[PDB]
Amino acid sequence: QTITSLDPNCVIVFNSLNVEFKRLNIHSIIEPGHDLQTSYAFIRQDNAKPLFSFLQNLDFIESIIPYHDTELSDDLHKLISISKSKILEAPKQYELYNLSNLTNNPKQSLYFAFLQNYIKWLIPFSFFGLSIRFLYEFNSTYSLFAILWTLSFTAFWLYKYEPFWSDRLSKASSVIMLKKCCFIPVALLFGAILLSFQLYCFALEIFIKQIYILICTFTPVLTVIYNKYFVEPMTKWENHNAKKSKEAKNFVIIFLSSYVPLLITLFLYLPMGDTKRYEDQFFYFIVINQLIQFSSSSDMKIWSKVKSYQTDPWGATFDLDANFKKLLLQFGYLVMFSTIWPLAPFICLIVNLIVYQVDLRKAVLYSKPEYFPFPVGLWNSVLVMFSILGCVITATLTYMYQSCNPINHSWINIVLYAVFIEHVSVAIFFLFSSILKSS
Amino acid sequence: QTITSLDPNCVIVFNKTSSANEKSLNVEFKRLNIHSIIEPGHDLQTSYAFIRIHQDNAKPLFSFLQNLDFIESIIPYHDTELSDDLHKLISISKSKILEAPKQYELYNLSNLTNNPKQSLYFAFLQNYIKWLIPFSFFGLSIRFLSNFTYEFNSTYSLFAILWTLSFTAFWLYKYEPFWSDRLSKYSSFSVIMLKKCCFIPVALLFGAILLSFQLYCFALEIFIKQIYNGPMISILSFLPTILICTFTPVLTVIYNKYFVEPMTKWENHSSVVNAKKSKEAKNFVIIFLSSYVPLLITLFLYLPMGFIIDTKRYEDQFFYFIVINQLIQFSMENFVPSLVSIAQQKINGPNPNFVKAESEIGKAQLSSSDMKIWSKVKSYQTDPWGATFDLDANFKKLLLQFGYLVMFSTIWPLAPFICLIVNLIVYQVDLRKAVLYSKPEYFPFPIYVGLWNSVLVMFSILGCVITATLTYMYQSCNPINHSWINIVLYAVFIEHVSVAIFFLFSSILKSS
Structure with a gap:
């Protein structure tokens, strides 16, 4: 399954299995990160504050990153294209x-x-x-x-x-x-x-x-x-x-x-x-x-x-x-x-x-x-x-x-x-x- | 039915000059849920309205008061028990004045x-x-x-x-x-x-x-x-003062x-204050x-x-x-107004000469x-x-x-x-x-x-x-x-x- 086709919305960086089963209600894909011990775990609103509540005490996560949506990414690209012109305005x-x-x-x-x-x-x-x-x-x-x-x-x-x-x-x-x-x-x-x-x-x-x-x-x-x-x-x-x-x-x-x-x-x-x-x-x-x-x-x-x-x-x-x-x-x-x-x-x-x-x-x-x-x-x-x-x-x-x-x-x-x-x-x-x- | 028996908590003064306006009976009608006594006041155009105001019927009273636009002023009078506890507070402040x-x-x-x-x-x-x-x-x-220093x-x-x-x-x-x-x-009225x-x-x-x-x-x-070098040198020194x-x-x-x-x-x-x-x-x-x-x-x-300073x-x-x-x-803020009031008797004692003030006791038998x-x-x-x-x-x-x-x-x-x-x-x-x-x-x-x-x-x-x-x-x-x-x-x-x-x-x- 292509991760772009999964339409990711956020990423979780980890160095474990306790979160792999934790996402039994949210679809995710795991892939090693820049270094071997790190691993970019891509995750696709239905999960309210409880997400952060359990990630706060999970303690196996290096950082929290909200990724840009695909359609949202195209929208931001369009904004940057609009702002590309008017360099002197x-x-x-x-x-x-x-x-x-x-x-x-x-x-x-x-x-x-x-x-x-x-x-x-x-x-x-x-x-x-x-x-x-x-x-x-x-x-x-x-x-x-x-x-x-x-x-x-x-x-x-x-x-x-x-x-x-x-x-x-x-x-x-x-x-x-x-x-x-x-x-x-x-x-x-x-x-x-x-x-x-x-x-x-x-x-x-x-x-x-x-x-x-x-x-x-x-x-x-x-x-x-x-x-x-x-x-x-x-x-x-x-x-x-x-x-x-x-x-x-x-x-x-x-x-x-x-x-x-x-x-x-x-x-x-x-x-x-x-x-x-x-x-x-x-x-x-x-x-x-x-x-x-x-x-x-x-x-x-x-x-x-x-x-x-x-x-x-x-x-x-x-x-x-x-x-x-x-x-x-x-x-x-x-x-x-x-x-x-x-x-x-x-x-x-x-x-x-x-x-x-x-x-x-x-x-x-x-x-x-x-x-x-x-x-x-x-x-x-x-x-x-x-x-x-x-x-x-x-x-x-x-x-x-x-x-x-x-x-x-x-x-x-x-x-x-x-x-x-x-x-x-x-x-x-x-x-x-x-x-x-x-x- | 005496004023003290009523034990008023609010005193409402109003311009009773427009007798035909009959704001007094308006207040009486609005006050079907409580009891009050209205008697002539200091001036022949002013008459107090002692009432017994409580929370459950508080707001409608003030609503009718602003809708009436005839009330001269309002007074949150202290009743007997308020008088007692302010009196004992003032007596306590009367003790240990040094501290x-x-x-x-x-x-x-x-x-x-x-x-x-x-x-x-x-x-x-x-x-x-x-x-x-x-x-x-x-x-x-x-x-x-330090003594002299x-x-x-x-x-x-x-x-x-x-x-x-x-x-x-x-x-x-x-x-x-x-x-x-x-x-x-509190933020009361x-x-x-x-x-x-x-x-x-x-x-x-x-x-x-x-x-x-x-x-x-x-x-x-x-x-x-x-x-x-004036002759009355000491006299002219008071002129600047x-x-x-x-x-x-x-x-x-x-x-x-x-x-x-x-x-x-x-x-x-827009705000008065x-x-x-x-x-x-x-x-x-x-x-x-x-x-x-x-x-x-x-x-x-x-x-x-x-010349030396x-x-x-x-x-x-x-x-x-x-x-x-x-x-x-x-x-000036304590005794001067009372001195002015008492000297007003010397200048023109009954200058306003409101007869109602003196005959109110005769007409009320309080x-x-x-x-x-x-x-x-x-x-x-x-x-x-x-x-x-x-x-x-x-x-x-x-x-x-x-x-x-x-x-x-x-x-x-x-x-x-x-x-x-x-x-x-x-x-x-x-x-x-x-x-x-x-x-x-x-x-x-x-009250709001x-x-x-x-x-x-x-x-x-x-x-x-x-x-x-x-x-x-x-x-x-x-x-x-x-x-x-x-x-x-x-x-x-x-x-x-x-x-x-x-x-x-x-x-x-x-x-x-």
């Missing part, structure tokens, strides 16, 4: 609706909704960026539009579309939180070494270039030890849920390792003291790194599909955290340093369109499905933090560099302006939040 | 009055006094043990900041949710926002005049006291009658500035910028603000207890002390005192002690009034904060930053050697730190 809203009805996966729905909203709000921002660029450095009008757009987009996402999206897709606590709070010192401890060596390598580089690799070598190592002895042991101590906690601790290293060199470059190298360095630096982190970080026979085909689900990391489970992390890093870079290069939202729009295409393809075609047809959190806070920080940073940068001691204002003025804009933006965001919450 | 009353008395009160508003306000007051006890102990300890002591300032944040967080996230859930267990933001220019239009006038009178006071005390209420009247009311109609709050909270939020702008702007201008411009002047002001003005504000009930309802309806429990004004008072404490404790470390004592006596008086003299609101048997939390958080943050700034200003006290830039950046730094600490405490407590 805004993604259509009903595409998210169709995929949400077909695969019923909250994670993809939420991330792709965020991407579609980002692209749709980036179209006017990118069009405006082109218009100002060609009709240009640290222009006050661009910065005003930037802060307006940042506040509006963050408020609209966090209070208008997300409540519609997140709510529909879901359709010793104090001691634990204190243990999570115990990570405050170690985080700053490692961030201090990170910042110190970024400053060190920057100093040596500018000495070589002016008065006369390490970063790529240092940063990867620290994340290994910083997790090996600190992150996972302490999360085990927290004893949760746990997955989001690990990403919370890991983020501090990524934040500094990404934004730190350009921040210190602008804030220190130029005011203290080449003249064209900062544009090349921003091109390096707004174009270059963007592509780097982005970068029967049918029975055997289904077998290889399961194999690429288990192994083949591209076909592994959708990891919402990493995609959201890359998107929010790009959003950071955008709202924080777009005033130096008005075409930055344009590159961001092209990149986001391509990225939505490739991620849609990855999620729907090869990624391991997560949710059966029949029966967020930290990142929103990071988004709000990015909004406030980017608004303050762009306002302060424009204040210093309205005309390039190269700066016409004393450091007292810079700090006071920073505080002024910080409080104004904090008030503005709450205003927008309440206004859109009333809706 | 801060236990939450057991609060549980009894929540059981008896079934009133969420009073229960919540008294819970806030009880937690306030309970957290004030250790603060008062620390205040006396720093005042005496009691002004702007670092340890006291740090304790003030930590205690402010801890008390605000604990009240917000540990006790308030419990009390809100307990009260809602978009363009709007845009216009509220459109009120912000109005809010700035007013209040700015207040601040300018306050600065005017501060300058005048300093001018008369320091550089002036009366000027302020006359401007603030007149400004309140202008703000209300010309801005607050028109704009709150302009918003058209939402409208009332909007009116109070608008009114808080004047109260905040008027109450706190003098000490701030003195401490931040008088001593720094400054009076060294003890800041304590001269703080003495009045946290010692005497406390008493003035406490008396017993002493029946007349007692009648007079109690009359006080409910007319006496200023008989109004419904106003959570708004009481919370405003308590939070004003709290703001004074958390923003100027670093000067007078015995301020927590006077706060402890005044809050103890205030709790006693308010409990007496709210369980024996205040208009009832919630029936025992059921917001702003102050936000202003409390704001008060905590402002108090923390101001205490820290003053400590940095005068612990090593142009008297100040430090640069103003350093102070202004220090302020925002500790603002950040306090916000972070508040977030940490909020998460830790709310996790439960």
Whole structure:
């Protein structure tokens, strides 16, 4: 009997006979997996929650995988074919609706909704960026539009579309939180070494270039030890849920390792003291790194599909955290340093369109499905933090560099302006939040 | 058939002026299932209707009440046994006045009055006094043990900041949710926002005049006291005080009658309580500035910028603000309305001269207890002390005192002690009034904060930053050697730190 003709709907991976007789009421076919001890057991709604109830305590199963139906697979193929066109157009809203009805996966729905909203709000921002660029450095009008757009987009996402999206897709606590709070010192401890060596390598580089690799070598190592002895042991101590906690601790290293060199470059190298360095630096982190970080026979085909689900990391489970992390890093870079290069939202729009295409393809075609047809959190806070920080940073940068001691204002003025804009933006965001919450 | 024999549980007053309308017989007909007595009231156009209301026939009564659209007001009168148990509760609070009353008395009160508003306000007051006890102990300890080094002591300032944040967080996230859930267990009887933001220019239009006038009178006071050679020099020193005390209420009247009311109609709050909270939020702008702007201008411009500035002047002001003005504000809400009522007899004794009031006994022949009930309802309806429990004004008072404490404790470390004592006596008086003299609101048997939390958080943050700034200003006290830039950046730094600490405490407590 061909397994495709059996029309499979889910797969069970095992390394025994107790489940072979267990499926005396559901038809199944057994076939060895990628490795000999593993074996892909293909299973064709009539069995309610009891399936998961007995698989929970069966304990002879390696993992649970909901496979795609044959007709459902053709439907997803048709969706990916429809999305194949419009490579240079805004993604259509009903595409998210169709995929949400077909695969019923909250994670993809939420991330792709965020991407579609980002692209749709980036179209006017990118069009405006082109218009100002060609009709240009640290222009006050661009910065005003930037802060307006940042506040509006963050408020609209966090209070208008997300409540519609997140709510529909879901359709010793104090001691634990204190243990999570115990990570405050170690985080700053490692961030201090990170910042110190970024400053060190920057100093040596500018000495070589002016008065006369390490970063790529240092940063990867620290994340290994910083997790090996600190992150996972302490999360085990927290004893949760746990997955989001690990990403919370890991983020501090990524934040500094990404934004730190350009921040210190602008804030220190130029005011203290080449003249064209900062544009090349921003091109390096707004174009270059963007592509780097982005970068029967049918029975055997289904077998290889399961194999690429288990192994083949591209076909592994959708990891919402990493995609959201890359998107929010790009959003950071955008709202924080777009005033130096008005075409930055344009590159961001092209990149986001391509990225939505490739991620849609990855999620729907090869990624391991997560949710059966029949029966967020930290990142929103990071988004709000990015909004406030980017608004303050762009306002302060424009204040210093309205005309390039190269700066016409004393450091007292810079700090006071920073505080002024910080409080104004904090008030503005709450205003927008309440206004859109009333809706 | 006497009123006391009826033992009324509800008193229904109505505009009996339209006698031909005959709403009274309408109520009698609707009340075929229960018994009642209706007698003339305080005014010749008002007459009470004492009834005996119970759950099984509760809802149809209220249904007919709203369908009647003739009822002036409703009263959830406490019967004989309710009177007895509130009396024994008030006598128990009359004992052991020295000790801060236990939450057991609060549980009894929540059981008896079934009133969420009073229960919540008294819970806030009880937690306030309970957290004030250790603060008062620390205040006396720093005042005496450190001896002459009691002004702007670092340890006291740090304790003030930590205690402010801890008390605000604990009240917000540990006790308030419990009390809100307990009260809602009983729960007995978009363009709007845009216009509220459109009120912000109005809010700035007013209040700015207040601040300018306050600065005017501060300058005048300093001018008369320091550089002036008038013959009656001591006489003119009192002019700024009366000027302020006359401007603030007149400004309140202008703000209300010309801005607050028109704009709150302009918003058209469908919810009545939402409208009332909007009116109070608008009114808080004047109260905040008027109450706190003098000490701030003195401490931040008088001593720094400054003929020789009076060294003890800041304590001269703080003495009045946290010692005497406390008493003035406490008396204004307690004895002033009764004094006005008794002086109304002097001005025009029988100014309304309702003959029905005096001849009602002759026309009814009530017993002493029946007349007692009648007079109690009359006080409910007319006496200023008989109004419904106003959570708004009481919370405003308590939070004003709290703001004074958390923003100027670093000067007078015995301020927590006077706060402890005044809050103890205030709790006693308010409990007496709210369980024996205040208009009832919630029936025992059921029938089918917001702003102050936000202003409390704001008060905590402002108090923390101001205490820290003053400590940095005068612990090593142009008297100040430090640069103003350093102070202004220090302020925002500790603002950040306090916000972070508040977030940490909020998460830790709310996790439960």
